Amino acid sequence: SHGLFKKLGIPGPTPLPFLGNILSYHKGFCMFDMECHKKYGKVWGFYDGQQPVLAITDPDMIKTVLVKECYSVFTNRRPFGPVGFMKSAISIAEDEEWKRLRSLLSPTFTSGKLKEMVPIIAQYGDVLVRNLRREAETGKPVTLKDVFGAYSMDVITSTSFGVNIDSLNNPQDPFVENTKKDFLDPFFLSITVFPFLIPILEVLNICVFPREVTNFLRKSVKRMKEVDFLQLMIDSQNALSDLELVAQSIIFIFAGYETTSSVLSFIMYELATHPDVQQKLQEEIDAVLPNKAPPTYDTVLQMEYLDMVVNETLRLFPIAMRLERVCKKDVEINGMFIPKGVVVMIPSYALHRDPKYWTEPEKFLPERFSKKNKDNIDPYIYTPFGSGPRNCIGMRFALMNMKLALIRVLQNFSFKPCKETQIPLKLSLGGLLQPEKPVVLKVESR
Amino acid sequence: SHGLFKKLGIPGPTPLPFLGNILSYHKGFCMFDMECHKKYGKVWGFYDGQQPVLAITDPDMIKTVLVKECYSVFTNRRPFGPVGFMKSAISIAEDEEWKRLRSLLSPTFTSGKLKEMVPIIAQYGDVLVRNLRREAETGKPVTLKDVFGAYSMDVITSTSFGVNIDSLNNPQDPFVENTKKDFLDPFFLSITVFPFLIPILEVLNICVFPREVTNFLRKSVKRMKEVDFLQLMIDSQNALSDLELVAQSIIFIFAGYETTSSVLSFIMYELATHPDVQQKLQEEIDAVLPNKAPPTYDTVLQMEYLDMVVNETLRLFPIAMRLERVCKKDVEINGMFIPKGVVVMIPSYALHRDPKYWTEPEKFLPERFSKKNKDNIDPYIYTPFGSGPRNCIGMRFALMNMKLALIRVLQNFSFKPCKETQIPLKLSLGGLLQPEKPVVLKVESR
Ligand code: HEM
Numbered sequence A, B: 001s002h003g004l005f006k007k008l009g010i011p012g013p014t015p016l017p018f019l020g021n022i023l024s025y026h027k028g029f030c031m032f033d034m035e036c037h038k039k040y041g042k043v044w045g046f047y048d049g050q051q052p053v054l055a056i057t058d059p060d061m062i063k064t065v066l067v068k069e070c071y072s073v074f075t076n077r078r079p080f081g082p083v084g085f086m087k088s089a090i091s092i093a094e095d096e097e098w099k100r101l102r103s104l105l106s107p108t109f110t111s112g113k114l115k116e117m118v119p120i121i122a123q124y125g126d127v128l129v130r131n132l133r134r135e136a137e138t139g140k141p142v143t144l145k146d147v148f149g150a151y152s153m154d155v156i157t158s159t160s161f162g163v164n165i166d167s168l169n170n171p172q173d174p175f176v177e178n179t180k181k182d183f184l185d186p187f188f189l190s191i192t193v194f195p196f197l198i199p200i201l202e203v204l205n206i207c208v209f210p211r212e213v214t215n216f217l218r219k220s221v222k223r224m225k226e227v228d229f230l231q232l233m234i235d236s237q238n239a240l241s242d243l244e245l246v247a248q249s250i251i252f253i254f255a256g257y258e259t260t261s262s263v264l265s266f267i268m269y270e271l272a273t274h275p276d277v278q279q280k281l282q283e284e285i286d287a288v289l290p291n292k293a294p295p296t297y298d299t300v301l302q303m304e305y306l307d308m309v310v311n312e313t314l315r316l317f318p319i320a321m322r323l324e325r326v327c328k329k330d331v332e333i334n335g336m337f338i339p340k341g342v343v344v345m346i347p348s349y350a351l352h353r354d355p356k357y358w359t360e361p362e363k364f365l366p367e368r369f370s371k372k373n374k375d376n377i378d379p380y381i382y383t384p385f386g387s388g389p390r391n392c393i394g395m396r397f398a399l400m401n402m403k404l405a406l407i408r409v410l411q412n413f414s415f416k417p418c419k420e421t422q423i424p425l426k427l428s429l430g431g432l433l434q435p436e437k438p439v440v441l442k443v444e445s446r
């Protein structure tokens, strides 16, 4: 199948037998997408093993794939094999089963339901301000990914189940341990080169995740049916099923974990290495919330510079890195024939740093998203939450959760680079958007 | 997945782990379908390995699956794995690709194209009458499956390519050998129990058929593009592709081989063991074609008792044995919920011999199809060529080919049981509708 793009007239790096272009991933997904974009231009193809992948960078064509032809042609993501009951998860379901799940979970993520969760999420921001203060009086630099990781785990366990716990101070609560139970492991690289071996894993009872966890979850869900994501899904039954509920809650946990704390780590890195932005944000936060006033839903949506800082961080670090859709049928979009079975991919990371649309894209400059310049930004080039009907359903929730944590922490602390701070920051090598070395910063009380 | 039918409330034989009910195939597919129909009634489920299979016998429900909901729900047959370029064959293609092939091959099988092939098919009936006459003067019983097999191979090579050859007398013509190059092999049983190992075969270059054949075919197709199935497909290009042409011609050869000669063997067995029917047919043949007159398209459609004999043989021996459709989506038909992925199966063999619709079904009685009693026959119980949009596209061609051979042979010979004739006939054990022992009969010249 390695002759597909050569017969279509699509440029791209010459693939090797069996491997495709996977050896070119040695620089990471991001650098490979940027390099291909430089040498091949607007459209190029490559092979993940035998699987052809067509990258597209034209906004009109991106709009067609993500919006116009979502239901008709580009409905599903890459099927990373049938690997268990997780087929009922909304991010994984396909075609009519996904639409059913999307329709049943959309009212759960309204702004009305989000405002109801604001008082709950606010309590743990105060729990956050106490934990890092203990590690701030220690005089030693703080690893943010552990206080943020503790905060992130606190919020999702209470917003999706109602289990109010201080994780960093309760090492093993029976729920913290089972929730706390490496995406840079060679296994994921072998699955792409051996997609035919996925059926062997599915029958060999090599279930995704241990059956100690998940079984702990379905039992916990049963005892909680007698404001959070679970109650909204329980009341929706009063349709969804019970094992479907466990599947969605699993997605929310992975969603709200290594995205929430990672973006917060990138944000605090940018604020520490740009003190003028940090003070400007603190002056905005103190102006809206005088004397460390508690942040509310409406006061958060009142802070413009906070939104610009969050958006500029997500440009430099789009934690999804790529958007993908599988071509359901032979189609032709915006001037080219897309054959069936090809994976169409939008390289978000490379587009966010493309000088075709961004001035000095390596620089952290929040003013790109000022109300003067947010007009000149194509929504199909800047896609931190995707676009179209299958975009990030938890975008509003994620933005609100991160901002509430930013406000409470910046109302109390300033952040500066320490001896151990990796400057400039390097991105992790092999497939997840995270710092190479964990971010460590000096923290001081205001 | 072995608990599917137990949760649906559908009866059936208790499956074993991993194997399902495949051990119950020791009596053959036919006996297993009859036994299940006796003990479980109108609807029952079983497991081919992990694959659930739901048998249905209600005519209204059969009409819904084959006709009403063909495009919407029950479009495709069981995907016996992706096992090469044969995915472009009409009997194997799925959904929109099958409709395209069906639409491009329908005009090829009209009665107008069939009448045009009558003079060609007629020549080899005369070639047939000479070969078995040589083995008739030998005074020894004749194995029909070899003179019929030679005739069957003659007709399809000339109706799909234009290669006029006497196979039995030309042992190795470069085309006869490559065309002549066991469906009761244990391999097919292992594929059902190990459907996850099919992807390994597809990548390990264990192609279906040797690459000596097929490569001989695509090269032969290229040299023939400068009345038969090929010309009608070549002129249709003037759309279809060239490797698609090789795929369809492969299906026609398998179609016109072990079906044409097998049914003719069953027919001659019934005519030999029922001499009154044989003489009655010979008296009809001589009445329409006086003095061994050559059979034509219109004279063949003029013989009513010939049609009744052919139809009654196809009732006792429906060489397809089963019809199958894959349930594309969660649906409810005629009072029961059919979940996605279940294989819905119509047990044609068991329905053709069901005393609920047939008086003494073991008896060969052509009068069931007299114009008096062909009214009382449900077309969804007697399904020798299937039904609905995905029925046998070559039904008219197959009926005409067999009848022309029957007429010419019966105009010259009578058939009687020999010492070596297996009476009563036993069906082959393991998956193909063919005699256990090959049919041998005494042949005499009129
Ligand atoms: C900074 C935080 C987050 C970012 C940057 C982010 C980004 C994304 C992106 C880029 C996609 C794919 C969109 C596409 O393919 O077009 C996505 C999908 C999704 N996200 Fe997020 N996400 C975040 C947090 C969350 C959270 C907190 C939740 C839920 C609690 C969530 C739930 C989902 C779901 C369910 C999908 C799949 C939706 C579907 O397939 O219909 N995300 N996210």
Ligand code: HEM
Pocket: B066, B090, B091, B092, B102, B251, B252, B255, B256, B259, B260, B263, B318, B319, B320, B323, B324, B383, B384, B385, B386, B387, B388, B389, B390, B391, B392, B393, B394, B395, B397, B398, B399
């Ligand atoms: C006595 C001779 C034959 C019998 C009893 C027979 C029977 C059948 C049956 C039962 C089916 C499946 C129908 C269904 O699933 O509803 C079928 C399919 C088919 N047959 Fe035949 N067949 C015969 C000869 C032929 C011949 C000679 C050809 C072509 C030269 C042919 C071409 C096909 C094709 C292409 C299909 C699949 C059609 C599709 O999927 O759209 N058959 N046949």
